[PDB]
Symmetry: D2
Subunit: 344 residues, 4 copies
Amino acid sequence: HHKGFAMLSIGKVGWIEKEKPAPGPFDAIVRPLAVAPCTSDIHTVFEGAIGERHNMILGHEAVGEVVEVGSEVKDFKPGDRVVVPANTPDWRTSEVQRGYHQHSGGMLAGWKFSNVKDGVFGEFFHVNDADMNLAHLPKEIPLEAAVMIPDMMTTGFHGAELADIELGATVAVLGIGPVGLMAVAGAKLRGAGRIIAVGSRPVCVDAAKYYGATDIVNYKDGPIESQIMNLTEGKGVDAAIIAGGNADIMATAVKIVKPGGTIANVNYFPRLEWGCGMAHKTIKGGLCPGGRLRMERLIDLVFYKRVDPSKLVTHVFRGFDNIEKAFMLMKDKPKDLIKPVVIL
Amino acid sequence: HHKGFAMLSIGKVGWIEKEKPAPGPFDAIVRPLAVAPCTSDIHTVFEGAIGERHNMILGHEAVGEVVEVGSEVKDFKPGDRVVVPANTPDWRTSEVQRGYHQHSGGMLAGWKFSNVKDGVFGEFFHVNDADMNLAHLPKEIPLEAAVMIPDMMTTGFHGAELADIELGATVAVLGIGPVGLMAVAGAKLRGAGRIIAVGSRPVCVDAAKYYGATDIVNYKDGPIESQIMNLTEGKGVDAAIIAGGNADIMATAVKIVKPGGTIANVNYFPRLEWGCGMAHKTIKGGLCPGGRLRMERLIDLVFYKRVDPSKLVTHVFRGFDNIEKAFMLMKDKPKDLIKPVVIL
Amino acid sequence: HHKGFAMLSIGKVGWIEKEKPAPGPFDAIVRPLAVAPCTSDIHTVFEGAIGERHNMILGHEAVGEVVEVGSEVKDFKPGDRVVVPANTPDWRTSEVQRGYHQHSGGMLAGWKFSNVKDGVFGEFFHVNDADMNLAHLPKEIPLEAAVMIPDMMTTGFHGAELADIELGATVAVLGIGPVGLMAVAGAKLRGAGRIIAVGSRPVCVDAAKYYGATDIVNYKDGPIESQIMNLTEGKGVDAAIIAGGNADIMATAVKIVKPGGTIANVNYFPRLEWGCGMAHKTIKGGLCPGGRLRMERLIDLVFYKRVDPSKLVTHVFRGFDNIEKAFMLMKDKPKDLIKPVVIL
Amino acid sequence: HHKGFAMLSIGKVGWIEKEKPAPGPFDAIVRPLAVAPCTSDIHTVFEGAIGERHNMILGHEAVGEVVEVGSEVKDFKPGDRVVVPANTPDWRTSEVQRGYHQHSGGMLAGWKFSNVKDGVFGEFFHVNDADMNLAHLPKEIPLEAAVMIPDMMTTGFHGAELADIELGATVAVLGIGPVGLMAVAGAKLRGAGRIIAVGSRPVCVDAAKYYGATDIVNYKDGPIESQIMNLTEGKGVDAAIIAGGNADIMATAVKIVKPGGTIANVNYFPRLEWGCGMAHKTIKGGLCPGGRLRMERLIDLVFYKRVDPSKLVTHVFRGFDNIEKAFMLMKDKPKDLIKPVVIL
Ligand SMILES: [Mg+2]
Ligand SMILES: [Mg+2]
Ligand SMILES: [Mg+2]
Ligand SMILES: [Mg+2]
Ligand SMILES: [Mg+2]
Ligand SMILES: [Mg+2]
Ligand SMILES: [Mg+2]
Ligand SMILES: [Mg+2]
Ligand SMILES: [Zn+2]
Ligand SMILES: [Zn+2]
Ligand SMILES: [Zn+2]
Ligand SMILES: [Zn+2]
């Protein structure tokens, strides 16, 4: 019996008592050391993104310490400091063998935390297939930087990877939230040249400039498409990454990308003509990549100072009782907030 | 001064007389030996697909004999039997260096015939960059089979190529017109296993069965999506090729393709969720591939009996005066018609 | 306690008694219905390819029926007719997540049969990770055709896949043994145009002509390189697949492939210059692909009549006692032998 | 009639006077503003790398100003400051349509400077297909940095591109010459994690540390293979780039790369086993990339401060007469020399 911050119903949250999870032969029990609320939790609680839930613990971004393992777990033991990916696929299924985007398949059943399984906002949580999902966290990486790996960094970096960025190419990132900031960082990591970031919030604009954006487009000089086309002298961009917005941002991305380019869509929750190139494009989407290898490679990127995700963390809280406060801060989204982190 | 079948205005066609085209240093003049009307010509004439045109010769699918060449033309001489691609890109521009889909770039200005330039339905027509566009036609290939190469075969085969077909994968082809039939043939050429063809016309169904379709889905038996999902026992298809229909066929293709799959759109003229794989897809579109290398490789495929496009030709006409009759047949689309060919 | 045909010390084979294998929670026990000796077994026994072995049952190409399964096996039950791949990777390790060639990784520890584990030439054998390795065999596929799938078909088809074959490209297959014949079939399945097969044995030449080879090069007519260059008028081939021979055939393959082409090496057991394209090549090698998905896709290819591997089977034997006779036939390769099959 | 620094014969070098080149309709005449000798010139002169030459002007790395153009040249006019790529392919032949490595084909005939055509070490030189080869140089890029683009930067960056580097992967660079330093920079630009540089010269080691190398392996501390395997704890590297050395470095690269990895060979001038992964590798080689688009993308990388190639320049000379001194310095290869540059 442990504590957990759970969704009572659509629009209701509170602290409840639940039975302490037990690990199977291939599972592990992890207690969190640092957690971070996400906009997905808010969409679930208040927008009914995944339907109706009752007494479901929220949260899917945690860095924790292993406290219990199954009998068949070999690579991790209690006391090990680990990074828990947000997506934890089932690896004992032939579906994982299918594979796409140069990674493993079956990445639809991996979205378990806070969807069909208790989240990380508790004293303990359950990780399936621990040897296939968990990754060791070196002691030289701070907790606030490490907690950005499980969801934000992996989603943004996969958005950059799917954009088919060539060396020196011009890349546009629509939406400069945390996922968009990580998309800018990933575009820089892919050898992009000019990077155009679309956004208006001063703190997000400063973060985008820090992470490698060379041009900032504000939705006050005029339409986004006109500004971007004027920036590139009518040539457009080689690739665009969609990280936030509404359906109009998809039309804008189609408008601004050159024929043969790629539009990557990682934002969670027309006709072919001879004289118009708007339909001569590739649109790739997916919240695919999770697992131990992905986490290990991101950890290697952080460890060797290729990227510093600490700039995403604008608010730091101490103690278990501040999870609700961080969630509320995520709800009302003040102007100076990018991503809050609770250190346990 | 020569004759040609031209679009008088939106909805008006007739035989007009025009000045004989002259070739530049890198150009060639070709007289046609076999031509084929397309649905694109009908869309331009009667649906205003490309705007208003005046006395513009129609047609973009011809097999012809070189009549005269420019001073800088080296690989072709008058008397050579050649295949003229529908797309003839400008090759003396840096745009062709920015390629995609493992071919050259600049494949938007290549759509010249019957769009911004006189078509092939005349006694002569003009081909730009002859050494980079024309391809030699061996005498062992019949004219009716060869005339299917310039547009239908290349479009269908590129649709199959962009679908990312793996060996033994299940492929669905939506629309079994000539482009869809060539898409079925290309899917077979890419090592597909089960091929599901969606269509109802008996002649097109017979052609699809001939070209490698193992299952036929008729829309007179219920929704396409439900039938296809029943055929695959709820697994869906690995890839889908869109060759005809309306915007609802795009939704059907998105519904039937498994997560991580590819939807290829060669038919000329959702939100990311944890529990729904509809948005976890790749959509590739383009009427890209033209030029001499593409024509030569298709000619090699025909020559070595890898594919026989003669089944597409259901009506054969002799004489220049039958071009109007073939165009009218294309307009009224009778029961037994797939593709008419006029032999000069 | 069951019977098995085993290698005794070296150059010595015989029938021995061994303890009947028992399955783990994720394993299954399979009895064979059809088996096929391989040249790899002969290299192991007589050439010391893998070192010294004692009482090790040989054979790695079997089609069998499930006899019993572990408690955690869900997709297969006793009585099911299955195809057993030659490569059976360990799937409960993070190594398979790495991945290459658009398939799963860790395909080095999968070579277990007759290498570090008892082979299939016994009354029973052990298959690890049954739900991830075994594949259902439909009743409409004959045993002789099905037993070509586990090693020959997968190796040849992966050789064709790694060759980066484009539609209509010219492909050369060096060595027309069973793996080379399957490479010819795979090249045809990938949309190749001209296919040049290099070999001299009349039965293998006939099989190569059946599987899609358009040109046959005999080494009794001069050097292979000179003949191939004469066939292509000095242009060379777009890709080459090496299926048999020594380092000299690798040198020939480097010589005959055009700059930028790919040489695929699936045969088990230069300096960069401005004016010479010999080193401007890509050489891909690997006995990679194994597992349930690979077997299922190959089974789909056979089921839908995309390929008929029955032409490989030249000798058919009945009864358990004929395994030694088939192995001896494999040893002293006669004129009319391609692949012997023993039906149980 | 102009002066030029030419190779008199094998081992003989001096200043000669030659007729001033004249441009064709698609050509341009360029006078150099900064030039850099290369090891390729020394191999040509003192080692007979390309055979015997008589009065052939050397040099293939220049940044210059357009002096005059042909009648068909449109994108460049006299007075324009341009970057001249070392490889200048013929763009009016169908061969460029073939294409590989996601760029254009026909790149073997692009190696013209100081091979089959007068080099850049003269008062003027000839550039074929100016609109397809030349690239505008912004005034904000210094000459010393810009002159590293034509050969060193493009070769190293293509070596990094062909290595198939994934985010966070470990990359080894064998050879820490200027091409190897640019390979380290390109590996960093591709999102590599740990980068291991193999070299011993202190100036080259310092440059490698500057460009992103995290580990340095000195051959005075034991075998390279053993040191690298100890660094990675026996796992090896995900990819290796060969930029200098002898045939033993290829064996070392094969030994250190993990199965399924890629070895890229850009340094100008095993059998498949079940238990050994040495042959389960991909070897890619080529001095491929040249042309206007490549130069423009590299210029964009330099302009937006993604890479600073000024660290390569250790010796700067002023005046035309110092070309011989720079060439001699390249011959003697002193301790503190990486790349000399002559500013005109
Ligand atoms: Mg993905
Ligand atoms: Mg992973
Ligand atoms: Mg295309
Ligand atoms: Mg072409
Ligand atoms: Mg493989
Ligand atoms: Mg598999
Ligand atoms: Mg290349
Ligand atoms: Mg270029
Ligand atoms: Zn999240
Ligand atoms: Zn058409
Ligand atoms: Zn075998
Ligand atoms: Zn050089």
